[PDB]
Design an enzyme around this catalytic site. Structure first.
Site, PDB file in Angstrom:
ATOM      1  N   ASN A 295       0.813  -1.207   0.000  1.00  0.00           N
ATOM      2  CA  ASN A 295       0.000   0.000   0.000  1.00  0.00           C
ATOM      3  C   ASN A 295       0.851   1.263   0.000  1.00  0.00           C
ATOM      4  OD1 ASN A 295      -2.330  -1.515  -0.011  1.00  0.00           O
ATOM      5  ND2 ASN A 295      -2.844  -1.145   2.142  1.00  0.00           N
TER       6      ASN A 295
ATOM      7  N   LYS B  28      11.249 -14.498 -33.626  1.00  0.00           N
ATOM      8  CA  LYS B  28      11.012 -15.086 -32.314  1.00  0.00           C
ATOM      9  C   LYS B  28       9.598 -15.634 -32.192  1.00  0.00           C
ATOM     10  CE  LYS B  28      10.045 -10.990 -29.521  1.00  0.00           C
ATOM     11  NZ  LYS B  28      10.560  -9.708 -28.951  1.00  0.00           N
TER      12      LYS B  28
ATOM     13  N   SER C 154      22.447 -12.308 -22.283  1.00  0.00           N
ATOM     14  CA  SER C 154      21.918 -12.085 -23.619  1.00  0.00           C
ATOM     15  C   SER C 154      21.994 -10.598 -23.922  1.00  0.00           C
ATOM     16  CB  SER C 154      20.477 -12.585 -23.746  1.00  0.00           C
ATOM     17  OG  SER C 154      19.558 -11.512 -23.637  1.00  0.00           O
TER      18      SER C 154
ATOM     19  N   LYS D 172      15.078 -16.786 -34.652  1.00  0.00           N
ATOM     20  CA  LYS D 172      14.478 -15.628 -35.287  1.00  0.00           C
ATOM     21  C   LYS D 172      13.762 -16.058 -36.562  1.00  0.00           C
ATOM     22  CE  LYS D 172      18.639 -13.651 -34.006  1.00  0.00           C
ATOM     23  NZ  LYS D 172      19.402 -14.668 -34.791  1.00  0.00           N
TER      24      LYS D 172
ATOM     25  N   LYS E 197      16.123 -21.787 -26.338  1.00  0.00           N
ATOM     26  CA  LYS E 197      14.941 -21.421 -25.570  1.00  0.00           C
ATOM     27  C   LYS E 197      13.803 -20.986 -26.489  1.00  0.00           C
ATOM     28  CE  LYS E 197      14.424 -17.328 -23.670  1.00  0.00           C
ATOM     29  NZ  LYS E 197      13.594 -16.474 -24.578  1.00  0.00           N
ATOM     30  N   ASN E 198      12.570 -21.269 -26.057  1.00  0.00           N
ATOM     31  CA  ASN E 198      11.393 -20.609 -26.606  1.00  0.00           C
ATOM     32  C   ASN E 198      11.513 -19.094 -26.415  1.00  0.00           C
ATOM     33  OD1 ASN E 198       8.987 -23.172 -25.761  1.00  0.00           O
ATOM     34  ND2 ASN E 198       9.455 -22.413 -27.824  1.00  0.00           N
ATOM     35  N   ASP E 199      10.813 -18.346 -27.262  1.00  0.00           N
ATOM     36  CA  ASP E 199      10.584 -16.923 -27.022  1.00  0.00           C
ATOM     37  C   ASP E 199       9.499 -16.788 -25.954  1.00  0.00           C
ATOM     38  OD1 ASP E 199      10.496 -14.070 -27.393  1.00  0.00           O
ATOM     39  OD2 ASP E 199       8.893 -14.331 -28.871  1.00  0.00           O
ATOM     40  N   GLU E 200       9.547 -15.697 -25.191  1.00  0.00           N
ATOM     41  CA  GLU E 200       8.704 -15.614 -24.002  1.00  0.00           C
ATOM     42  C   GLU E 200       7.202 -15.717 -24.278  1.00  0.00           C
ATOM     43  OE1 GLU E 200      10.434 -12.836 -25.028  1.00  0.00           O
ATOM     44  OE2 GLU E 200       8.873 -11.332 -25.383  1.00  0.00           O
TER      45      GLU E 200
ATOM     46  N   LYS F 253      25.050  -5.117 -26.398  1.00  0.00           N
ATOM     47  CA  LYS F 253      24.331  -4.015 -27.026  1.00  0.00           C
ATOM     48  C   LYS F 253      23.008  -3.813 -26.280  1.00  0.00           C
ATOM     49  CE  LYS F 253      24.186  -3.822 -31.563  1.00  0.00           C
ATOM     50  NZ  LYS F 253      23.607  -4.474 -32.772  1.00  0.00           N
TER      51      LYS F 253
ATOM     52  N   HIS G 268      17.696 -13.715 -16.607  1.00  0.00           N
ATOM     53  CA  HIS G 268      18.479 -12.796 -17.422  1.00  0.00           C
ATOM     54  C   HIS G 268      19.055 -11.680 -16.559  1.00  0.00           C
ATOM     55  CE1 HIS G 268      20.040 -10.537 -20.683  1.00  0.00           C
ATOM     56  NE2 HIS G 268      19.121  -9.589 -20.655  1.00  0.00           N
TER      57      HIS G 268
ATOM     58  N   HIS H 225      11.914 -15.828 -17.012  1.00  0.00           N
ATOM     59  CA  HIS H 225      11.953 -14.764 -18.006  1.00  0.00           C
ATOM     60  C   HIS H 225      11.238 -13.540 -17.446  1.00  0.00           C
ATOM     61  CE1 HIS H 225      11.591 -12.453 -21.675  1.00  0.00           C
ATOM     62  NE2 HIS H 225      12.358 -13.328 -22.300  1.00  0.00           N
ATOM     63  N   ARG H 226      11.904 -12.385 -17.503  1.00  0.00           N
ATOM     64  CA  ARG H 226      11.449 -11.190 -16.809  1.00  0.00           C
ATOM     65  C   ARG H 226      10.491 -10.324 -17.623  1.00  0.00           C
ATOM     66  NH1 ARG H 226      16.804  -7.916 -15.358  1.00  0.00           N
ATOM     67  NH2 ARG H 226      16.818  -7.860 -17.648  1.00  0.00           N
TER      68      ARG H 226
END
Lengths: 453, 453, 453, 453
Positions: free
Chosen positions: D106, D163, D365, D161, D186-189, D326, D318, D284-285
């Protein structure tokens, strides 16, 4: 009357097996008065399948021997197309519950027989590969114990007496006392969260006893904790609570879970197998006698129950002492162990391949002791078993710890192919088992009295 | 030998019942040759409790009649202190699995008897109030159907034939055809997700058939869908999938769940009862005959199985036609229905109060039809049952829809206390049941031929 | 640079909406120095979809206004093909978590903008019908309270002070004291199973307080119990434990479940929504300010959060007093309530139809009292809300019970369209609210002092 | 105004830490106009605890620096008694959701500040030992890969790619192509069960691609499969389905599970952590920027989010390229990795011990390649990371397989302390990375053109 549709006695069993598209089941069946054996057999096939595109999936009677069992009935074999069996939405595997509902479901209530008993069954490759099977067995215990994972051998166990009624502190003390010599301890099948010994009081004391015994002996110890419940959420709560208590001492992988699989049913075993796959699933058969006792003309023979337990994922299950202990016993019950642990096994009517499905480990119990283990091992052909000895451990005149050691030493003696009496001269706990059970020593090793003093 | 500790024949059963601190169990037991009845009885009490503070929780033999059943054995009664029974960590309730493991567990495998069968049991208030019990029953169906929730009466059902093998579209069509007149349809107990009729193909078609029949008749229809599986996650997936398909038509509360409770075991019933409490839990007993058939001297009598089903939470369960259909039948089996549905019921050995635990609804099946229902209702005393008629519905010479109507009309006739033949003059579907089953009409209503033309 | 692929400013929003094949999202976005608005917008569309058959599912920038918000950035709208969104294996529905990961996922971490904020979004019919939505809301409370399920009206609530720290007995006593006049009580959002007030100590006392207040008043009372946890098995354990405690008094459907939905995330809300659908899911937003505060240029506006809560299945959620209490307040926040409770609502950028998805009930809190409720109701247009008043109840000079009554009486007065001062002459608790908060009475009802004495 | 109760600036932080009875939190806070820094700080402490036996558990402001951050506000530190924090009924552990609801709940919605941001927090031993923590991390991958479990080193990964949008067969082909040289995919998110690439179509093809690549290379390969969902039953269904598909090739322990932990919330992470503890939980964030972006004055700094992820049980998460790739990049972000992986780490305001809680593995990454990895490793101090390179792998002029090899070879070069140009003469794939990214080679290794031809 339905024999024209649901029976084809011209089918050859070998063609059905080599084709790999049918589960086969052998039964003992006794027709009721007035009914013909084939008519009742065909009725059973109908009741056990399509009850009547439908023709392609009918179960079929392919063999009968009406006089095979005299006044106990005859032999009946039925072929079940694999297309009859159910598939999980999640993973496409066969439910054991569903398979049971077909091959031994409504046919157990029919009025035109006086008995219908499953004797054996055959699963083809396509079905075997579509059951869960075990995820864990004695090999994982061998790893925790620092043994080779190949033929790691015998695990010395006990049961605490009285089996139910001990308060938390006396129970943990008995665990400690045994663990100073032995390895494996199990809850009693109805011992769990009674008011006189609450789970959240006794489990911390047992975890502490394990830690103390392990620090004092330098040897790893194992505990099989009862998580039996009806509700999956409760069994999850029990298992997570127990593992966390043992994790406080670094001993979470020293825990096995005891599941009273007959009274929970396959669904309860599946809860433990799916949620806790890497925790050894110790299947306790309490109550199975209603289904498997030879005193009943219904149900299924013990060998069938063993096969079903492996499919459900039992890591270990009680088999019996095979005439070397103090129960129903014949050396020829070794087939129960072989069917549980081998990659392939001949059953009473069908040869069964398991196609790499993990073994279910035999858990031996029933008035065994160190002297008797030698003959038991020799008959079985190996010692890759868990063994709970009540009197064989606490009945040792030097105490439960000495008893546990005497059991390990019995394994060493067999493993070495040594003469038991010569072996005893150099192993005190084994030698003292002769004095603990001299009725057995006089029988098995006449002369020991003089050679050992 | 253990009779001194585990037997007290001076205890009075009435004192044990009025005290409310013991579960009592009556068994039929036959001693093996060489063993005395009391010695074996005491052994059973020990094996079923403390196996031997422990004295306070011993089970006690309090009554024996060694000759009660002639060559089938004698009567044995054992008192179990309530402190023996387990408690969930979550809600403190008793697991059914655990209770079973004590009163009918290892005692089913003993070698000093030739038979041990549970006949009845008594639960005191403190135990009854500590089981789940049902959450849903016929009263919830009455609500969905727009009936009074008091004595909403009879629900006309059917089973689809062939019971297994129909592809998805023919199965849905048969459902539609019946629902144009009848109300309730169930899956067959092993009908689920076979490759020839995948769940995700047939369930949408059944939901659509329900919607069409409801739009065309203006009457609500019910479907009982099989969700049987071993794994709780799979049973959840099945139930959620099915409810969502019916929800697309606004009919989610028109769905009941069929659970093959014997082959899943109590744990599978508990999954449905805990996760889906407000969805009617239709308990199918497929396979129970191995445990309850009178041909076995092991296991338990059907009345005991009924009591256990209610405790587990069955919303309804098959009972039988009680001699008015075509099965094992005596009018006196009405006690099975009474024990399931009443708040209090006298059993064979014990009077049982249920202390407000919801009823389990009898599901009647076994060659019933509209003509027979009158006598069946009169014997039972009410018509608050679900009834699946195979031939009584599709065997109607005017079709399954007319058959279903003829069943409803049988309920109306009984409810009105009307003369069946006079009633038929003003109700065509009931009248045409006379022609559909004239063997029964000639028997039950001699003269109908002339009065009805 | 990617504007050629991921932008089509010639698309017309009305065509995208009438076509029903796209989710649309409006954002406030501020380009970083050196970057063009369209280039960054196209980059956002790429990052939020295909990151680059792929062309058919690209997200597309269809509208930009680079100067819409001055130094806070410009307006950006993106169309998301519905084919981008995920489907449960179980029921084919869209996960909220997944939708969030696309329209407000990696685009929140990009370096070529200084802010990216969701302002509104449009779901077409095909998507709305594929979310869970609520199963329960105030209508189910109205039923438990014996009110009409149409416009059952206002539910008078409170919060206990201190919100955290009270031991079990003082907390239950405060609940009893209020329930003698008021209806609804909630846990504080972090109040659960602390060592100084264990769940299994306080919940039985609260259940007992409810029973006592209900027996003494003859009126039904409601309690919203915190079941927040990370682990679904724990939230199941909490909910089952709580419902069973209230069931001991027949009050299981008087329980709502408080879930701190922001800190559990959508997965925790879904646990309660799927396992306990018929228990009112009271969504507490504690922590949401990090995501929705206007002080952040990231995240999403409160209206978006409200829409997401309804899709997840919140039965009720806090909205705010809309300028009539003591918080951030404008009468124009009524759109937050309208978007939660109506079948259709205009949002800041998109008109949203809900296609029969159940309402999420507004839960009003923030320094409200009986005098203020009149203007609040008049502005909202109805009184179908739950309202927790801290000072408006316990701050009543006659006590919390009188305070609760004064809140109900405010609803009656508004419902009757009566003059508040005239109404107070015949309703003592409402009249005594004037004396309890005379600063407000002097303002809202000048003259009351003389007319009421 | 509440400063007298909720502030004690005479408390010494070192006494609070050495006492081990408080969680401490540091915030950046900006008072709203008209409010004093201490008054607002005390209000925050009240809102974040007892909101006001209660005195013993009040949160206390113990340090303020009103000018610490200029126009962005000042520094505020609050001590939270450990007794404030919740305990699971099941295992007594602290929910992360609950802790969040107090220290950042709160207080994120208050009107008397213009910003409140968590910068760091301190957990004492008694709390750290009472969180789940990870069950699996890179050490388990090292074991599956046949590496030492001590410093097993670098795992070469990629992302496919585009993705999102690839149909099942092209996606599996890209996996195969990379796995001929690289290790981890990995899978894409948001890639899961879209209609254009259904899970039950693509997952079998990926499992087959893994098997083929492993048979052709003799090297083990890893796949991280998205199981994100709202509903725990769905995430269970996804995980069990995926593991079974990989188990058909003996590769079930080659599977990791990707969980979009920010959009599921801690509850979704806990589902995977509790049900699938031995399957690497790849956190995965996606979306976390709304909470952790420095552009917001609300929420929490990335370091805090990292600490919370470890407590929840992330096996890996990550972190970022730390100025060598980059993205947002500074070599000093290495503290994010150190706080995740070390047993002890200094944070911005508090030294944190983890008391044996397993590491969470950094997943690197962001535009990394083989040439850049050397400097990255040297700065970090080790190479015990997973690394997904999009362009660094598929951008290799010899193809994705060669790219993957060039990444492994970068690890070998660093491990050997070899001169990169000399190393390249004997390792072709690494040498060809110079030609693939010559802009970087010219920078990092001037002269390479001549020495390598």
């Amino acid at each position: 009357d339905q024999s024209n549709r649901y029976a084809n006695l011209d089918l050859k069993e070998e063609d059905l097996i080599n084709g790999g598209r049918h589960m086969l089941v052998a039964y003992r069946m006794k027709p009721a008065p007035g009914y013909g054996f084939l008519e009742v057999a065909a009725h059973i096939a109908a009741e056990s399948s399509t009850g009547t595109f439908t023709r392609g999936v009918d179960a079929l009677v392919y063999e009968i021997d009406e006089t095979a069992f005299g006044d106990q009935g005859g032999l009946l074999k039925i072929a079940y197309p694999v297309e009859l069996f159910d598939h999980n939405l999640i993973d496409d595997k066969h439910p054991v519950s569903h398979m049971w509902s077909l091959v031994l479901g409504n046919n157990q209530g029919m009025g035109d027989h006086l008995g219908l008993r499953m004797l054996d069954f055959y699963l083809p490759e396509v079905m075997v590969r579509n059951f869960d099977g075990p995820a864990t067995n004695i090999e994982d215990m061998w790893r925790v114990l620092g043994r080779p994972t190949k033929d790691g051998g015998y695990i010395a166990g006990t049961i605490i007496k009285p089996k139910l009624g001990l308060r938390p502190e006396p129970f943990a003390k008995a665990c400690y006392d045994f663990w100073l010599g032995g390895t494996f301890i199990k809850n009693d099948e109805p011992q769990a969260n009674q008011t006189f010994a609450p789970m959240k009081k006794v489990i911390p004391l047992v975890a502490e006893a394990m830690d103390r015994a392990q620090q004092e002996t330098g040897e790893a110890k194992l505990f099989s904790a009862n998580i039996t419940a009806d509700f999956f959420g409760e069994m999850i709560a029990r298992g997570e609570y127990i593992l966390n208590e043992f994790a406080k001492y670094g001993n979470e992988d020293h825990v096995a879970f005891l599941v009273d699989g007959f009274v929970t049913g396959p669904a309860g075993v599946a809860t433990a197998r799916h949620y806790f796959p890497k925790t050894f699933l110790h299947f306790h058969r309490a109550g199975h006698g209603a289904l498997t006792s030879y005193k009943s003309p219904m149900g299924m023979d013990p060998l069938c129950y063993m096969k079903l337990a492996r499919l459900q994922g039992a890591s270990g299950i009680h088999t019996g002492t095979m005439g070397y202990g103090k129960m129903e016993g014949h050396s020829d019950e070794r087939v129960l162990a072989y069917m549980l642990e081998r990659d392939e096994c001949q059953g009473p009517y069908f040869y069964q391949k398991w196609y790499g499905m993990k073994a279910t480990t035999p858990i031996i119990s029933g008035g065994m002791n160190a002297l008797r283990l030698i003959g038991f091992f020799e008959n079985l052909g190996h010692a890759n078993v868990i063994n709970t000895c009540g009197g064989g451990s606490f009945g040792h005149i030097d105490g439960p710890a000495a008893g546990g050691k005497s059991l390990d030493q019995a394994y060493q003696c067999w493993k070495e192919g040594a003469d038991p009496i010569e072996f005893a001269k150099e192993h005190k706990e084994f030698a003292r088992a002769f004095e603990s059970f001299p009725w057995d020593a006089d029988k098995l090793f006449p002369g020991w009295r003089e050679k050992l003093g």
